[PDB]
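Quick question: what would this complex look like in 3D?
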Amino acid sequence: IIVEGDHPSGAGGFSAALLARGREAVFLRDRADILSLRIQAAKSRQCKT
Amino acid sequence: EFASSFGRPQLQTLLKDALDQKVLDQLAARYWNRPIEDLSPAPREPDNIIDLPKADPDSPYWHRQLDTACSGLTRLGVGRLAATVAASAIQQHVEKLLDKSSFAKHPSARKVISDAAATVLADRSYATSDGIEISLKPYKFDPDIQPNEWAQGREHVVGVLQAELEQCQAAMKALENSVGGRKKLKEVMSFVDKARKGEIIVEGDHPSGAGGFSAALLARGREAVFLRDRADILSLRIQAAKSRQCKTLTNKYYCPEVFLDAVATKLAQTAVLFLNVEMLNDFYVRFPREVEAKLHEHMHAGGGLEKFAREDPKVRRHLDLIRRKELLETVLGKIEELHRISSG
Amino acid sequence: MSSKLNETTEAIQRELEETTYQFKVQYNEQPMSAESYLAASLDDFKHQFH
């Protein structure tokens, strides 16, 4: 899906504030998953040497 | 066969339908809710339809509202509406009959017939309209409603109004299934209601995302709220038309639906009589003469008889085949004669 | 101008027709003047006062 910005009140079936909170939530998700994986990998046995 | 079929009660139902929609238009534009365009608080108009049964009987607002509603309904071109409705109906019947007739091919001859019907109806249209307005002139002044007519309008309003409601509810539910869950559209509806109250602000002329809702989702929510309010008003007016207070004729300003339907039925029937006489009989008499004259004049003036023959592939080859055979026969006759004149 | 004169003339005759039609359907062709309005309303008031 792609959307244009002629009406910045409602995009999709979601409100503008709900959409913004969703963007922040997705960024937090991706960076969190990466961070946890990289912590457990830095604690992994393969990083011992 | 068709002319024996048509008659006058068909015209009655035809007029009563156009006037039914006229009633819905006038009543809806004078009483019911106006659309939601943005997400700003709407100031609540002082008089509302929910407080109509419990209203002061001498209310200038409701009186002026029903009065301008009825005068608006009567001082419309009901003569020209009846004339054009009956015209389109008659012409359409002629066009369908033409479809099933032998003139499916030959679109020129078909067009000649159709144009003959059209020109006859057009010739008679004005006299029918003016005569209908003159005959309705006494009912424009005092469309006095008898208790029996009031009952008839009462029974008709319930059906007309509930049909309008069913169209409304079916559209609402389809909107729900389109947006997704009923509960989710209930969420966007709650958001639009909140923005319509002071509870939340959006400051947007075209809001893209607010509270997590897309630009299309907001539009679907406003559409849902309008459908809701119109549904509630419609059901409330149905309950009112079935109310005991609308059974009697004395509460004419309290029951605009029943009154406006009564006026519509009356105007339809008295207009229908003059319509059948002035227009319908004139069509049955002028149409066959016009068809024959115009077809003959078309064939001979335009040379479209030869094209009428050329048009069908089967008869084309038929009319072509005969002369060549005749020529070969005459040739052989000449040779056979040649042998007879000279033995060797 | 002379060329457009004929078509404009016919159209003017038509809108004179339509103005007459609205005069027929909505006011029933009732002639009206300010003096007639004032006199009728004054008599209405005098009947009320009587």
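Answer marked as accepted. Chains C and A do not touch (no CB pair under 8 Å).
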